[PDB]
Amino acid sequence: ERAGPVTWVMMIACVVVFIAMQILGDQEVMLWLAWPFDPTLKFEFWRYFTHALMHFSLMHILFNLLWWWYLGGAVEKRLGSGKLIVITLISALLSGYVQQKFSGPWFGGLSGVVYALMGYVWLRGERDPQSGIYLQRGLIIFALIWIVAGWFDLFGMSMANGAHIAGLAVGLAMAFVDSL
């Protein structure tokens, strides 16, 4: 076994975008992929999602893709590709919405999606062991530490706190729905 097609294509997409950001510069890529930052861009539908594909540091991309590979891969394997797609689209969209509302359109990263997956896998395992999916103990601890670090700004980088919490919320909400 190994990462399914959705898991894989997201990782590829993130790496391609990250390479473009090194070659072209972060600003140039943000012009194309960021959440609409002018009313002229409001119909460029991709922008409501493609903010999730941009990363600004090595630490940021590595840890997000690590979590995505593990939790995304697990969701895809056990619950199917379709489920992972829907979690991803909902969390990207809502996390982006909340972030721009609090802090404006200049943000990016897969962590809204990652927080959704953390909450989803944990709550689904908790409420519905039958599902086969759960977040084992050690990972609960490491997810908590990761969350706490963003919240209290312990990576010396400016954090997208709205994206992070909206993400988590979405994941928990979808687990709750699915566990009924």
Partner: peptide
């Protein structure tokens, strides 16, 4: 820029 804010990091998600």
């Amino acid at each position: 820029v804010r990091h998600a």
